[PDB]
Design a protein around this ligand. Structure first.
Ligand SMILES: CC[C@@H]1CN2CC[C@]3(Nc4cccc(OC)c4C3=O)[C@@H]2C[C@@H]1/C(=C\OC)C(=O)OC
Ligand SMILES: CC(C)CCC[C@@H](C)[C@H]1CC[C@H]2[C@@H]3CC=C4C[C@@H](O)CC[C@]4(C)[C@H]3CC[C@]12C
Ligand SMILES: CC(C)CCC[C@@H](C)[C@H]1CC[C@H]2[C@@H]3CC=C4C[C@@H](O)CC[C@]4(C)[C@H]3CC[C@]12C
Lengths: 288, 53, 221, 336
């Protein structure tokens, strides 16, 4: 139906934008902004996590247009583990990039000892390792099931099915939305407070222009994260609580809210690389 | 003081030297390059098998 | 290929040492101590060959202060060596306003400080460098302006011959030398004998610079 | 006042003598020789490990090992073939401007704003590089050092003097005075009996090592000379200056033979070296490139454009296989 194509297209565009933006960021980092600074390592990790997250979208896009999962059991475990894995990896990279920018500004003396590129490599690997605390269990449980004459790639839980199914959703709610928002908001909020009292951003008209720019950037990253993830996270919680009748609006909003949580992977390249000051210099060299 | 006197003595030593013409100076430099032109890896790339890099 | 393998292992081993030494050096604060002779460079060290390196730690932060007074050669050839220094500590003796350079009496040695400060502050190597300007000998300067007008050094000065206005005017004249004000900060402190205040000022100014650099590294600024 | 006037007349005499010898120009007699069309040299190695700006590099006489000196306080001996690091010597002073690899390969010399040429013994019994001798006595800054042999090293200082040192005794056997400004560069003649020093007074002085006197003074640069390299036969040298020009100077004609410059080049030359035959003059620039010059035709042969900060140092292997370019970008690149 036209709506299904529209939903499929909305998932496609989010996929194409996400991959093209993230692969571009990784490309520029590999060749121009080497993975020397801690920031670039996080940017590359965020772009890689974002790219892997959005690589699952074509399979979900096909799994929606034709109403069945034609990619088999093995891929289902991969495409759901990559989804669940790259959500927590993408979120924890943002949480690390927030804490990295917070220690930089609020503990600058300690930041020198901790913000080494080596530590960025460790914390990045630790993000991927910890994100296996959900991706691996999801990989085991992400079995393909036959239902109503069509194949559905989903998660299979243990008895009681309610307990583990909601425990995953609750843990996805706490450690992928609540803990991130508190970290991202508190870290960047405390960051802006320090910046409000720093000599090179206060005491002049033009310096205030820079501070407004940094504050706008900080607000926009928090804002984009809240606008992208909150809709789907609450929608998942409401569905797990009460039965919402399936209508032409409930379906569209649901897929839109999923599309929006994947659009944070589409926007992470722009927010953290294309609007990075270091990248603008080196990106200006990019030939196309 | 004695700095000026040294300059004259230095200049006299620098003035009393046998100078050759720039055509024999230039010809010799040209001759050296032609003689060693073949054995100059940066001029004519040697075979890739012979290049240690 | 035991010999070849040992070479790579040796190369990896010193690669680790190079990284380890770089991290130890990356966290060190590098300060370039400048100023004309008798400007208070020696005393500021006490407050904390060719180049004299002074090491001090304050509030868990390690400082490396480099004195280049013994480098009487052309500064333009070696000044770029200190590009990337955290900050420049420029010492100016406030009492120099009433004095003249010994070699030449035409130029006021306070004016020499401004020309020196102007050269360094607007140097193309220090553009994004912050200058901890230390106005030294305030006590001696205060005891002079009571019987010697600041107009001897600044003809355009039209303020009271008191420490508050006179010292402030000298501070403004040095700060006005900074052409690119927006991209460069001048942290001016009137040096005091009380301990933990001159070094505290450097720490506060350097913390601001480190945060500023962190913003550059973080890509925010 | 007679001495100052006599100096001017002697200078005019020297100008008269050189003009008399200037029967033709190097360009005139090289006009018909075949031009080196285009020199496309590629980065074959990239030496990574220096964390600061590299100020100096020096190939060893084996054309395999090279010593690079960085502001990170490290002297790194590289195996250029494998890119391996053989030694990472911790400098007692991080402010280094020059490094020399002894032709024996047993020693490297390091120096800079410490005003000291540090001599390091590479081939110690214990296998650990150690300081053998610290040459003290310059009052400016070590701008350039070169070994004549294991026991002799010639230094150029910001104090406007070059010096010959006896490493075993650590004393200056000969002092080379006459430059007005800081001496920035030093090139030993192939026979090591003469060295030419380029100073900030915009002049190059040819020195007799054994006699300890300036045989000739060369002028023509509008600004300081940061780089000076002997032509392979020792009968000429090339200078690189902040005036964005390289100049070829013939010793026997005692004058400048060629000016290597381009309108698009306005930055200073940091480094100069010749190819093995001397046909190519490689110049490192502040504009982050090295320009390959036709030494005989004063035409830009090609460009080495692999550095993101200014090329600080060049080196051509004694075998002529490769040129090493060190930059303020912390990387050495080997080119062929
Ligand atoms: C790791 C992200 C988990 C787990 N995914 C596994 C399959 C899943 N991906 C889809 C993609 C496109 C359409 C879809 O359905 C119509 C889906 C899905 O159903 C679902 C989504 C979900 C989720 C937010 O997705 C961004 C979330 O829980 O947000 C709070
Ligand atoms: C593809 C998914 C499912 C698995 C990813 C595996 C994890 C371990 C991967 C993904 C991204 C990787 C990182 C990407 C980039 C860097 C920066 C580099 O300077 C050190 C290695 C480091 C830090 C990598 C370590 C391994 C890494 C963390
Ligand atoms: C960050 C901004 C967007 C604020 C957050 C908006 C949240 C609260 C919005 C975005 C999408 C919304 C859902 C969209 C569609 C439906 C179906 C309807 O039959 C019941 C409400 C319900 C389930 C909405 C609940 C509120 C919701 C989750």
């Amino acid at each position: 139906l036209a709506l299904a194509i529209a939903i499929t297209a909305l998932y496609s565009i989010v996929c194409v934008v996400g991959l093209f933006g993230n692969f571009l960021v990784m490309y520029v980092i590999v060749r121009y902004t080497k993975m020397k600074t801690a920031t670039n390592i996080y940017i590359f990790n965020l772009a890689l996590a974002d790219a892997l997250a959005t690589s699952t979208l074509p399979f979900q896009s096909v799994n929606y247009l034709m109403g069945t999962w034609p990619f088999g059991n093995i891929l289902c475990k991969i495409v759901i583990s990559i989804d669940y894995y790259n959500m927590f990896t993408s979120i924890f990279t943002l949480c690390t990039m927030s804490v990295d920018r917070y220690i930089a500004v609020c503990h600058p003396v300690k930041a020198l000892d901790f913000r080494t590129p080596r530590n960025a490599k460790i914390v990045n690997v630790c993000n991927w390792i910890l994100s296996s605390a959900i991706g691996l269990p999801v990989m085991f449980m992400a079995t393909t099931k036959y239902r109503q004459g069509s194949i559905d790639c989903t998660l299979t839980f243990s008895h009681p099915t309610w307990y583990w199914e909601n425990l995953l959703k609750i843990c996805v709610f706490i450690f992928a939305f609540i803990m991130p928002v508190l970290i991202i908001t508190v870290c960047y909020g405390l960051m802006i407070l320090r910046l409000k009292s720093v000599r090179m951003l206060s005491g002049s008209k033009e310096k205030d222009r820079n501070l407004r720019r940094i504050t706008r950037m900080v607000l926009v990253v928090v804002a984009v994260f809240i606008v992208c993830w909150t809709p789907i996270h609450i929608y998942v919680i409401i569905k797990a609580l009460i039965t919402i009748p399936e209508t032409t609006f409930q379906t569209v909003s649901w897929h839109f809210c999923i599309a929006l949580g994947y659009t944070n992977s589409c926007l992470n390249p722009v927010l953290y690389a294309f609007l990075d000051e270091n990248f603008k210099r080196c990106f200006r060299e990019f030939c196309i | 003081i004695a700095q000026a006197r040294k300059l004259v003595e230095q200049l006299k030593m620098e003035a009393n030297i046998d100078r050759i013409k720039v055509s024999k100076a230039a010809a010799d430099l040209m001759a050296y390059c032609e003689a060693h032109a073949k054995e100059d890896p940066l001029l004519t790339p040697v075979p890739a098998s012979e290049n240690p890099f | 290929s035991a010999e070849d393998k040992a070479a790579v292992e040796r190369s990896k081993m010193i690669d680790r040492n190079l990284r380890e030494d770089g991290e130890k050096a990356a966290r060190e604060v590098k300060l370039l101590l400048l100023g004309a002779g008798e400007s208070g460079k020696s005393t500021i060290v006490k407050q904390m060959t060719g180049i004299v390196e002074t090491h001090f730690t304050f509030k868990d932060l390690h400082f490396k202060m480099f004195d280049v007074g013994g480098q009487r050669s052309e500064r333009k050839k070696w000044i770029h060596c200190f590009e990337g220094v955290t900050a420049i500590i420029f010492c100016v003796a406030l009492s120099d306003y009433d004095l003249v350079l010994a070699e030449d009496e035409e130029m006021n040695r306070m004016h020499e400080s401004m020309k020196l400060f102007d050269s360094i502050c607007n140097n193309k190597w220090f553009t994004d460098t912050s200058i901890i300007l230390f106005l030294n000998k305030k006590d001696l300067f205060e005891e002079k302006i009571k019987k010697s007008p600041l107009t001897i050094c600044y003809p355009e000065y039209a303020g009271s011959n008191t420490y508050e206005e006179a010292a402030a005017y000298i501070q403004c004249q040095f700060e006005d030398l900074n052409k690119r004000k927006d991209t460069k900060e001048i942290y001016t402190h009137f040096t005091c004998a009380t301990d933990t205040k001159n070094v505290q000022f450097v720490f506060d100014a350097v913390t601001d610079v480190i945060i500023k650099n962190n913003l550059k590294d973080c890509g925010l600024f | 006042d007679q001495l100052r006037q006599e100096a001017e007349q002697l200078k005019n005499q020297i100008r008269d003598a050189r003009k008399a010898c200037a029967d033709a120009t190097l360009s005139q007699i090289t006009n018909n020789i075949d031009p080196v069309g285009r020199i496309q040299m590629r980065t074959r190695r990239t030496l990574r490990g220096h964390l600061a700006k590299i100020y100096a590099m020096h190939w060893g006489t084996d054309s395999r090992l090279l010593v690079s000196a960085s502001q990170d306080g490290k002297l790194i001996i590289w195996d250029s073939y494998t890119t391996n690091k053989v030694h990472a010597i911790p400098l007692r002073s991080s402010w280094v401007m020059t490094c020399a690899y002894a032709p024996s390969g047993n020693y490297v010399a390091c120096g800079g704003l410490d005003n000291i040429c540090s001599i390091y013994n590479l081939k110690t019994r214990e296998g650990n590089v150690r300081v053998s001798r610290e040459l003290a006595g310059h009052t400016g800054y070590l701008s350039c050092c070169r070994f004549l042999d294991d026991n002799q090293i010639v230094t150029s200082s910001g104090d406007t003097t070059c010096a010959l040192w006896d490493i075993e005794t650590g004393q200056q056997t000969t002092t080379f005075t006459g430059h007005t400004g800081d001496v920035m560069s030093l090139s030993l003649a192939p026979d090591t009996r003469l060295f030419v020093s380029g100073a900030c007074d915009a002049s190059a002085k040819l020195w007799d090592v054994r006699e300890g006197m300036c045989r000739q003074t060369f002028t023509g640069h509008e600004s300081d000379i940061n780089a000076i390299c002997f032509f392979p036969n020792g009968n000429a040298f090339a200078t690189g200056s902040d005036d964005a020009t390289c100049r070829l100077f013939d010793l026997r004609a005692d004058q400048e033979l060629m000016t290597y410059s381009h309108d698009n080049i306005i930055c200073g030359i940091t480094s100069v070296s010749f190819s093995k035959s001397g046909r190519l003059l490689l110049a490192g620039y502040d504009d982050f490139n090295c320009n390959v010059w036709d030494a005989l035709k004063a035409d830009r042969a090609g460009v080495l454009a692999g550095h993101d900060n200014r090329v600080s140092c060049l080196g051509v292997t004694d075998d002529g296989m490769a040129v090493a370019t060190g930059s303020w970008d912390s990387f050495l690149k080997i080119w062929n």
